[PDB]
Amino acid sequence: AALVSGTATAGWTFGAGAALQIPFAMQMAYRFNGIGVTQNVLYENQKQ
């Protein structure tokens, strides 16, 4: 439970260093870019 709660907002440093707080949607947008789909796609289709 702690792990999931943490990762939900903690992001990339969660298991590496100091905790940070990143807005959920911002984190997701990045991970999409991490695959190879332009970041803006997520925001436009955020609802879907």
Binding site: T13, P23, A25, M26, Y30, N40, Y43, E44
Partner: protein, 77 residues
Amino acid sequence: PSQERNFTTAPAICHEGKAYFPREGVFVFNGTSWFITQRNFFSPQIITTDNTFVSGNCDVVIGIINNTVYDPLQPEL
């Protein structure tokens, strides 16, 4: 990475009615000024056209805010 700071962010900025998105970094609001920088190290840069991109209007982007975008053309011309 370690010692950090609190900043306000934005999914995108609106300029000339168009939705501008960051390239490799994130938009960051400092003590009354917007910049763009990499997530892993706070080093703020001026927001310029060539360091961002534009796609779609300021219509469907949630949390989009108003801002300006620097264009070298102005001082160059």
